[PDB]
């Protein structure tokens, strides 16, 4: 629910410094258990507590003040929108897609000068002719 008792007891469980951060971050008091963190660095949680509405269970605590969505890792981003039971820290490595190259994680850079730019991948259709004269 949203009663005074619940917000009071969860604030008393978490701790007032993290509470004072969280109230400036979200409007709610939420007490999870650190299921896992991000390669970008984003602490996630999951709520046991019985007085929760549907799909209020799992949530992010970000890192940056200038947060948004799509700053999360994909294999987490599934679980944040509740795709899986098993968060990727607890999945077997058989379900890990094996890759032959390192990973970089560009989140999004819209408006930032790191924005994506487009171009046609291929050259022009018809190549010209280079001028090669012939002294007769």
């Amino acid at each position: 629910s949203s009663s005074l008792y619940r917000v009071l007891r969860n604030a008393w469980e978490v701790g007032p410094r993290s509470y004072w951060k969280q109230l400036n971050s979200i409007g709610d008091t939420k007490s999870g258990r650190l299921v896992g963190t991000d390669i970008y660095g984003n602490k996630f949680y999951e709520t046991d507590h019985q007085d929760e509405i549907h799909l209020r269970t799992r949530y992010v605590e970000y890192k940056e003040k200038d947060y948004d969505m799509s700053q999360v890792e994909p294999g987490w981003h599934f679980w944040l929108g509740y795709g899986v039971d098993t968060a990727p820290c607890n999945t077997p490595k058989e379900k890990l897609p094996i890759r032959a190259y390192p990973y970089k994680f560009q989140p999004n850079y819209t408006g930032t000068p790191g924005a994506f730019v487009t171009y046609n991948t291929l050259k022009p259709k018809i190549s010209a002719w280079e001028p090669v004269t012939k002294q007769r």
């Binding site: 560009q106 000068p113 050259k123």
Partner: protein, 117 residues
């Protein structure tokens, strides 16, 4: 690095971005259009913009060349590329490869080269 911007003026990007790939500098298609052509085409909408946060998507021709060439006991090989963990139908469809000629033979979907031995 410094390439002519159709006027004698040179544009100067670092050698980390005169690249087809982080894995390969050279082109691999007849109409590949190397980046030296591309910045030569439209640097107009590339100024005041970052050079780092574009894709550079780790091109495949280097990654396929260092996979071990497998061996087949009999004559006709089979390729799927399918995992044995994933509960479904993935990979490329079940085509077969004759390996008789001297040299390996890439499965024309997955690019894995097989050899008769």
């Amino acid at each position: 690095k410094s390439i002519i911007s159709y006027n004698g003026n040179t544009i100067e990007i670092p050698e980390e971005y005169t690249k087809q790939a982080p894995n390969r500098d050279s082109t691999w298609a007849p109409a590949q259009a190397s980046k030296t052509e591309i910045y030569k085409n439209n640097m107009v909408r590339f100024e005041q913009k970052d050079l780092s946060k574009q894709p550079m998507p780790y091109a495949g021709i280097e990654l396929i060349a260092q996979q071990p060439v497998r061996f087949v006991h009999g004559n006709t090989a089979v390729c799927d590329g399918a995992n044995h963990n994933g509960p479904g139908a993935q990979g490329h469809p079940k085509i077969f490869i004759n390996v008789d000629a001297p040299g390996s033979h890439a499965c024309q979907y997955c690019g894995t080269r097989y050899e008769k031995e």
